[model samples]
Target: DIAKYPTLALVDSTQELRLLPKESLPKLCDELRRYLLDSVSRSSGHFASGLGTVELTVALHYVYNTPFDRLIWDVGHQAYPHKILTGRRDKIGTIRQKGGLHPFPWRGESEYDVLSVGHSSTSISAGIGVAIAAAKEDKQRRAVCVIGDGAITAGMAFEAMNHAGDIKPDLLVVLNDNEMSISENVGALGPGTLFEELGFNYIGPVDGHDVLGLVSTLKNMRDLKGPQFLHIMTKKGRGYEPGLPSYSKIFGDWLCETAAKDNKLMAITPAMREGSGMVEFSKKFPDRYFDVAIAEQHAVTFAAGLAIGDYKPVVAIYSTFLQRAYDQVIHDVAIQKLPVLFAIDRAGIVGADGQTHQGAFDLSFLRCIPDMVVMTPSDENECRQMLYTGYHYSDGPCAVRYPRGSGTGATLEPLASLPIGKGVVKRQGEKIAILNFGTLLPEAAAVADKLNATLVDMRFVKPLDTALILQLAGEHDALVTLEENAIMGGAGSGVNEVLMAHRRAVPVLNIGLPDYFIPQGTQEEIRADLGLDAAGIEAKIRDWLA
Candidate 1:
């Protein structure tokens, strides 16, 4: 019965999506969910969020005149169903793949994707801009923003709501309350008091999975509006079974063990307790855990204050979100020389989340600060050790940045410290040397073996292993630096600076992320595209040597 709709096969625009009868929407939603599950299973993109939004996606498209109407998604994690309903149904499997469809809503990809989004809590602000522009131009069009309950906790969301209320623009904000934001939702403001105070006409906590009900509500709301709010309930990871552990769990385990030994040690996150794998730690040390909801800048300053009081504070944050606290990091932490440990998870090329969420600038940004010690781990055990090393280091601010997924099956032993400002030689060889930083060691090793080149894992980015690097420069004909950060002013630039200071003449090549913003794809796919994989590295080295 689901296969009977030939309209899905011919859908190349929103007009075609609206052509489908209302009665067929339920079956279409079911088929769309099935397709989403199948495609995501093969390519490994975001799940659960899209499953819960299947009915809502269908209902919104059915009621609204999109492309011209201005429909925006907050984080774009739940935009998979919206993509399928638009012209991208045939290319769904290629999402997050090399030279394929984008993983989230991209403005350049299609007319239906009105606003490009990867980060959270930005839809309302963008929607206001669109609504105001439409009003000034005297255009009869509706502006709608679909955001999650988790994102609404951010200060920016409230700021936008306050402004929208004052102006009274024609706008609709759909609060998709799945009670999840990567992790389960914390600190939800239940009731309409907040929204009412901000000057919005509040609607119900509607059942988001009901297609017919949603269509009816949206249709009625679309006609009469001046900053309206609709709250819809949902469940994340709906219909899909659970997967294995992430790198965050590794940090969580370390935190719990360390806190058990030391009473003064504290753990903090900006509404990311579950995402950062601190759920157990929070349970055990309830008094020591701080969940400051969605304020990155406050979290950093708060950690610095804690450090001043002689408490060991570990702030677990995503690499991208840490960018928000740059001023706090420089002024409050680095200048003061506070011993605040930053556990920066989700470093390097994050798959599917696209340019806005990629941890591309941390190396360049953190290294420039004075009294800052920066470290990157190659595997699980190294990560644990680095965390311990950063925690115990009392000289100044220290950070350990690790990638998102599981490690390379490395054995987890007791926490120990590696020597500061030093690196280790993984494999020794001849004429060419590969100075690898972060988790690109395995790829560098494979390239080194093929070319018979020397490989050094430079653990620290700030206080570089100058002795090892200079020795490698004297021995090798040409040197290549590899990292997962942007090429401009990155770890590779640090290597160049050291060589220049020593007055050593060495032909150097730096390989990393390009100058432009990288689009969405799997980490492996993006790496291959950027010439960071084993074959890509080998080819570049061979070409440079020639």
Candidate 2:
């Protein structure tokens, strides 16, 4: 029965310890640390985060009433242990795998998961929502949101905190101060000021490994009422000596370690590979490699600054997280046509983290803005090529989004700049033309092969590849547009807009993520669910023909 849930850990031990003795919590914390290290090392989810929050997770579960009194985790990266204790202990190994446990919290997964989360700096808002709803319902439910100090850099977090304080909703904001992001948490809050500001009844720079101290502090917050902030400072990696390196070494080393161990032997996970790519770019062009850690807003503005300086800057970031910099992407980058090269990683359904982490809006959002070139790559090799293309295309700011995890295992060719606004015809077939963007190329290829249709990689979203689309329409029976973004305002929609503007009467089917938020699962599963995968695309095309 326990194994029925694949991502949960501590099933055997958890039920026995509901009334866990306060003295035994420290040992539990130790066990949690070991479990996180062993599990993450092998499967490689959020490593430093859960390691950093072991004490906090254990303490919250130890002290709180949980499902009754809501405990909201910010991004859910640190929820591994929380998942373990709350009843999915058996499924822990399948974390992030297809049909497996999501890396983030999911309300559907368990009753204790109060708020579903994947994106960072959102817990406070969600917790506040829960708190307000409870008050309206005349329920006295307590809401606690555990947010990372790294997440604080985002403007939304502060806005929520400010509002939560103003509203004075029975909410507790637990600031898990680990002083690092995927990289170090940079921007404004320096070390000395951070600690001093945190010191108003701030319990630690305390050993996050100390369960009793954590439980005691949380218990105090639970009782005190009003919007309370508990800043608990802790190291990212507490127990494992090697895992907890200084800010600089932590990301790179961890990535290298995880990649080394992956059965697929990926060169590096996206976060680790990001800094490496920046470093590699730095080695070639030392003056241009700007590593702005955890400052996505600044990164966007910095790209604008570089564009003003006439230096082409590629701002590499995860697709889901880039939603934070939407304003900058619009105002600073697009408004000026300032050639900001956006290397968007994790642009599709990031498996196991669920809907919150799925990058289903970049194309839709970016396509709405004027003069923004949005492209997607098919494989690792094209990801590299597309980056080069985005960098050189000085006409405007352009984004090239790729997915998370190892690419389609297709050997990447030598990197070369692609022709701007041109869509390459990948295959030749009958009356059906599949226009695809991003790494969804594999799916397009599959569908094309199955239906004996033509496949075209519509490389540019802003500049309508009218020539190619018209050519494909002339050659094919019907046109199908594929992307990993919301269909409403996405790349496919852009193509439809183009077709409509030109008054082409060719029947077109736009295939992309639906309007709703897609929950966590593998990229393949999410695509399948949305009917964007190879089989899904084939089915839709066949049905339309019939």
Candidate 3:
């Protein structure tokens, strides 16, 4: 029965294993790694990172009193092994599936996952907040944040590091430096040399594979007073030689393979397109640019660094993933008004990955700030144009986010310079109006056709088209603002706020993601659940009118 669990042969490490009195701990680490690889391969959750953290996860859980002492991981990708040990082993088979254990750590899911973070580089900030709260409460619980080395390059992570270090809070930041972010760690901070200079007790470049050594090192770190840092080096994929690719390439390769296996017929878009745009940009321009794997923090700071050099740089990251770099966006880019262009992908409901990955917050977050320009596009043609627009426009920082899947089958057109602070009415109607942005134009058009309402593609969220909104208010009795974001501070809510600010009497309906975190599902399924789909939008309006 134990043989069926898929075990790997024990290999001796470069350094001697730590002689811990508890003998079963080392053996359990092996079992945990094997169990994680098997479960992740079957269900297809995060493979490599979790595999890499096997020893570290076991050592921390064994040493620290978890669920109470809060072992917070920055991104949840590396928490698979941690999840398995903490009463979640049985449900690992259903990882990322509906009504199953979440692929990422959820606070509600388990007592062990103290803070739920799908986005990267948030562990430190979240941990620091908890540490401050705990200190106030006088709870002797330790707040440990395990961050990847790639995450260290993020501006927000650095900001957290600086603040946490400056405050000298009772926190432990584990730099799980396997020198990677999905793929090998990219950007500056050349791999081998980084360990020598990194703050805290630089113990590793130790065999992350060595279970005993990890346990001993963690125990030593845990005993230290005040803020402590542990830099334990790890590999992206330790045991499995040819199992999976790096994290960066995983999504692309995952789509290709999953499509083939499931017989799913979906058109591949720029987001799903394998290794062309950003990957090429990173590879081709190696010295100046750094991929830093999937570490959004590094991407943001690296962009900031480039801005310092006066090199016009754009940081392209996923929409959901961008939340990880919010502080960096504010501090490094927006505060300084650095010329950083954010090429944000996966802006809306990203189909199967569900709520954890939907990028619905950038517009509201960036718009409230002083000098940030948030732009969205409708189709592939618009996507290209927006990219050009952001690239050329050299006034402070600008961000453009598009949906995950392909655009609305609109023919590709020549790029044009769009006038700032303007909106185009896609369709003109009398009774009702649908104000939309980004890739929601097609659906807005469909809803317009169905409801005979005017459809306006409000291109810029921050600089709302006051002239067009006034025109729409005069004509339509009711206005419905739709977006694939949280209704609280989303684009739709911004429109409503603007209308209220202007003392407009038009009754407005706001449709978007609810106040809570959304679970994973297909984009259409998720959108339908949120009433952003064409039929759903029409139904809501009809019911409201009646």
Candidate 4:
């Protein structure tokens, strides 16, 4: 393995890359791209941006003294190449493992990682601070912020750049226009005047893939004065395969089908439409689709108005992004008791995107709201039906939370409203009963079959299927509650409170994600690590039963 990478073998630190001749950068870029693809193919992390940014990453390091000079990556998906070049080449394959390297760049990981990042559009704001710091300390440092075109769609980028222009710190922004999402970059490749309007020396639609070309341009620009903005074009998914049907697709298909029947159904996505799987739905229901690029707060408040306008609005947003609109969700939707349906994707233990993007808190946050009806579906069919249920349930705000990937291979059924606060019994046996709150039904099934215990799919987390829980407490010797959310303030807490209210003295075991931040990895790997998988569930149940 050591002999395989001849060019890469020569360098441990990025200082050596700066020492190499200008012409030798092409081979180094080629080796970095090849090595990155090979390593990530075996040990999975984000590929599309990482593979595409190889040349840009190499060129940046070649031009700047990295640990001394500040280099920040927005969202950090494209930082894998940066990681390999800056002393972590040997451990590249171990990223996203439980105790291995973080999925995104971290401040503690290395001096080369200027700022910790996972959310988009923060690099410019963070880099501005470093830019100011260098001038204040008279360190003679140069700061560069690498942000994707998709990331620039957010208001934070605009706000930060506005401030950067006013103060005029010698900062550089490399806007990588990969066009890496459902919505195209708004006027990124258009006239350079938009950036010029912001008081920066705008330069280049440079060849992002050509290492030598990038090196030449960067070297020239590095010495030039004023707040500099460099625009480069790169191809996303250049070395990656296509994806299959996912939870987002399931939700999108359900939305299209349900909307066909009901004219009142409206769709809104403040994100790239691709991440939410709303592309086909967007075309099919062109008038109903609202692509509000990276504005989560506006998306929620807008949906509140749409609800008031006598329409059922489904806000298709990821769990992490929805946090931005916390007050909007509480005040606009929850307090008003509006019929806004929240289709929260990536609702628990999301992998690869790392701690910044995990769906850990939605259950706890939404469940605590007064007028909110929170439903966690156990499989694909239920996920579809739950959406339908949420749409028709016009009493208040409704939420359907599903995991990142597809579930159970369960065939999707036609749109139908499930009973709002009911839990269905999946299996019945002796002594112990397992109450499953979400997509962990398969794990429940495995343990139930093995232990000969009772299993129930607890559909609604808010109302808590109280009648069935009391019934089970009376019948079974002990009860177990399983969910993918945090053990604190989660669905398990709902069950515990139910038992306490009823004065049931039945012994209970509550299982879910731990209190600490879940490390990034495959969903299966995370679940198994946290004891949410089938084998792990069964072992826990076996010991408890004894």
Structure candidate 4, residue pairs in collision: none
State the lDDT of candidate 2 residue by residue for 337-379, as single tens digits. Answer: 7887776766777666677767778888887888888877766
- Candidate 3 shows a clash count of 10
Off by over 4 Å in 1: 1-12, 17-44, 188-190, 237-247, 271-275, 352-354, 409-414, 425-431, 449-452, 467-476, 519-521
Model 1 lDDT per residue over 262-312, tens place? 998999898888778899998999999998777687799999999999999
Model 3, span 50-100: residue lDDT tens: 888888876777677766787898878888887777776778888887677
RMSD of each: 3.2, 7.0, 8.0, 3.4
TM-score of each: 0.88, 0.80, 0.78, 0.87
Q: Which residue runs does candidate 4 get wrong by more than 4 Å?
A: 1-9, 34-45, 93-101, 167-170, 180-183, 186-192, 196-201, 205-226, 237-246, 409-415, 427-431, 449-452, 474-477, 501-507, 541-546
- lDDT for model 2 comes to 0.71
Lowest-sum lDDT 10-residue window in model 1: 1-10
Q: Which of candidates 2 and 4 is the stronger one according to lDDT?
A: 4
Flag the better candidate by TM-score, 2 or 4: 4
Question: Candidate 3 vs. truth: CA RMSD?
Answer: 8.0
Residue-pair clashes per prediction, in order, are: 0, 22, 10, 0
Model 3 clashing residue pairs (backbone): 153-298, 154-297, 154-298, 178-234, 182-247, 187-290, 351-522, 351-523, 354-520, 354-521
- Cα deviation in Å at residue 35, candidate 1? 5.1
